[PDB]
Amino acid sequence: VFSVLLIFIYLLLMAVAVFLVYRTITDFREKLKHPVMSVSYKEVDRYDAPGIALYPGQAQLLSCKHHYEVIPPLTSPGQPGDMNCTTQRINYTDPFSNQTVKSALIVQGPREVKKRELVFLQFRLNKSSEDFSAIDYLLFSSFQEFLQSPNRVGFMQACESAYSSWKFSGGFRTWVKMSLVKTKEEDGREAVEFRQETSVVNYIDQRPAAKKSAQLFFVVFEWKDPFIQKVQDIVTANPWNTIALLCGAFLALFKAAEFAKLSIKWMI
Amino acid sequence: VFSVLLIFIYLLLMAVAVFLVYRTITDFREKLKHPVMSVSYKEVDRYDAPGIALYPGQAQLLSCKHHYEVIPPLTSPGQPGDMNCTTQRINYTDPFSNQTVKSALIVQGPREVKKRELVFLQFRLNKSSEDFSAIDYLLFSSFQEFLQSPNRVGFMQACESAYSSWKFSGGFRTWVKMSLVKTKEEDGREAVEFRQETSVVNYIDQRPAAKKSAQLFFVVFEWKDPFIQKVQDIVTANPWNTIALLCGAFLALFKAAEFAKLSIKWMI
Amino acid sequence: VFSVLLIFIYLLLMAVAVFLVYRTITDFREKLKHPVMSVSYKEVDRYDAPGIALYPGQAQLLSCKHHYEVIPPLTSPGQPGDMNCTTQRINYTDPFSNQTVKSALIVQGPREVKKRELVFLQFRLNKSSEDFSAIDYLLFSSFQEFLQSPNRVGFMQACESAYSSWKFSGGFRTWVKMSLVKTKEEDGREAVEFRQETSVVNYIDQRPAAKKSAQLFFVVFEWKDPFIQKVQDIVTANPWNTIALLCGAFLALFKAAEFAKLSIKWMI
Ligand SMILES: C[C@H](CCC(=O)O)[C@H]1CC[C@H]2[C@@H]3CC[C@@H]4C[C@H](O)CC[C@]4(C)[C@H]3C[C@H](O)[C@]12C
Ligand SMILES: C[C@H](CCC(=O)O)[C@H]1CC[C@H]2[C@@H]3CC[C@@H]4C[C@H](O)CC[C@]4(C)[C@H]3C[C@H](O)[C@]12C
């Protein structure tokens, strides 16, 4: 009969509404669990002076110069001179071991990026008792923060775990091109880290055989490109959009049921 | 006349509805073609023992030791000893050529990551007849899987193409920091691959000139950080959301047409 | 009284509607500012011949050969021969300095990818007056474009800034595995760049002591895998979806107000 058919149609519409609700709930849960990633690139005319933390240990810093896009030939490799840069020593306890004390050297990085400003560091090591010579190094956002901070040690304990300390080797003029990655944690705070592309270049040993005992390290720190990579974890599980969608679907289903009832009545 | 104006308004609303339908269809097709990417990081207290597959060939494995965050100095480089690790040889046919037989060596990787556990491998090569000496290597998820698999050869034919085999050279204590990337294929299966950051460090030749003929290889395998990168291809082209949006728009347009008709009648 | 309660309910519904409108506006602005990223991998049976631009300078190109997945042993390192490849010299003004003139050499890269085709380049440098010997190099999409372009110099000024020029060092058979990243700029144009993974391998000096003065360079260019990474900045801030959502919410709110008024009248 017409009434039974209308009742069945209304029940089917109610079942469809319940299924739509279930699908929206499960999809909202899924989208909440899995935020999408948005990568943007910010133009910068001048980078904040990035702090470069080396750990020479027993290797003195022979030279620390600044240059623009090209390194001039060495007047006399292995001889100290031309410390035309700002440097600050420090000694800090390891955050993890808490016993070993690490002696770090903080150097101002290159500020100009459009001009390809770079910092050239020549170390030296004499009669090293340990094989596999290398110097660790790390990067943090601003040397000015290290300058003006109330306590400088705690800054280093924070940066040691905030960033990851790489290593560079002796006999290679390791060219380090840096870039900044700022990740939004969706908690009102952005974590800034350094992505460094290292290209090692061999060194020619033209020194006298006697001087071959000492092992020379060379490194260069510059800025890859004036792009800062902002990575934001966008969340598409917006409750208001889901509520609006569900209300629209419910109203459409109710009016479809009313249309079906009107059509059934008209047919009768 | 009022009737003509109402008819034109209703026709305009119908055209708007058709345009909305077309836009929704094309946007749904586009979103279906281009899924978005969601990157998440999973904390892990202990990594599954990762399998390191080397291909020494003619270079014997002088030493295979385990260490925690620091490599002790070599008592006597170039002298075998201290094989304090699990190793399994194997010979398998190349999946591509099917003729050349590769002799691989599977080593258990570092399990502890919070403690920075690492495996130190010292090989050696004597009177090498080939220039550009180096050893290939590759990584797969779990050495236990290789242990307990029914057929071990097929596991290697699968891993050779599933992962990409890198190379590490002689005279450099290549430091390999591993990380796991698990990509969801949206087919109920996740593909797990290794992203390895390599930092080479030169080696000091303090051996006698006569011993200089043999070439020594040194490599280290550890875990970068206790973070596993899950990359999921989220799909935003949800048919139910599109249907709900279209139904809501249709109902809104129908009621707008009815409001316009009522207003026209009231004006008359 | 019932009328006052109905008026308050209608006012509350209107306030909810205004809040929904504000939320939709702010969310649309946010989503417009932050597009999501979609990464897809396109299969390719054969890569377009990629153009490899070196800048040898004073380093002669001793050999430029092609090979399939394996480099045969050198018959006589440091001796020219076997230039079985296409090469084109050029001289162009630096886009930035505009004064220094760079002499570039364009070589056809490897076309076959399934067969692991690769190009092997052996240079040579004799009595170098500059320390830290190395040759720059860069990649652009197609060597055929450089062949058939009307002006070839302008192509180089475009590519120098479009891509980033890396460096490869002496004594290392730097193995360069290339991959293509095509980024959609949402402006009808796609920017194509090269991501190159470099694995350096030491070289054995078996040459006579007298020949040790000359420094030999070795490099290999191949294709990592037949996957092209398409990165598209998807935009989820679709105005039509927002309009449909808002219209659905408005209709639902108006009909809820009418339901409330009907219920109030029924109660009275
Ligand atoms: C875990 C989150 C948030 C927990 C909370 O805020 O209570 C999950 C658990 C259950 C989720 C709800 C499921 C269906 C809910 C009814 C609606 O058709 C619109 C989405 C709502 C309103 C969702 C809101 C949010 O997505 C919730 C609540
Ligand atoms: C290729 C896919 C899927 C093929 C299929 O499942 O038939 C495409 C081809 C045509 C696509 C349809 C276009 C408009 C359809 C009508 C609705 O206003 C809601 C989206 C619908 C329901 C879409 C569903 C899905 O997005 C489809 C079907």
Ligand SMILES: C[C@H](CCC(=O)O)[C@H]1CC[C@H]2[C@@H]3CC[C@@H]4C[C@H](O)CC[C@]4(C)[C@H]3C[C@H](O)[C@]12C
């Ligand atoms: C800056 C953009 C685009 C500028 C423009 O096209 O005018 C911003 C500025 C204000 C934005 C509008 C805010 C609310 C608008 C009313 C609707 O409830 C649906 C979204 C609309 C239509 C939005 C469209 C677009 O998102 C706009 C217009």
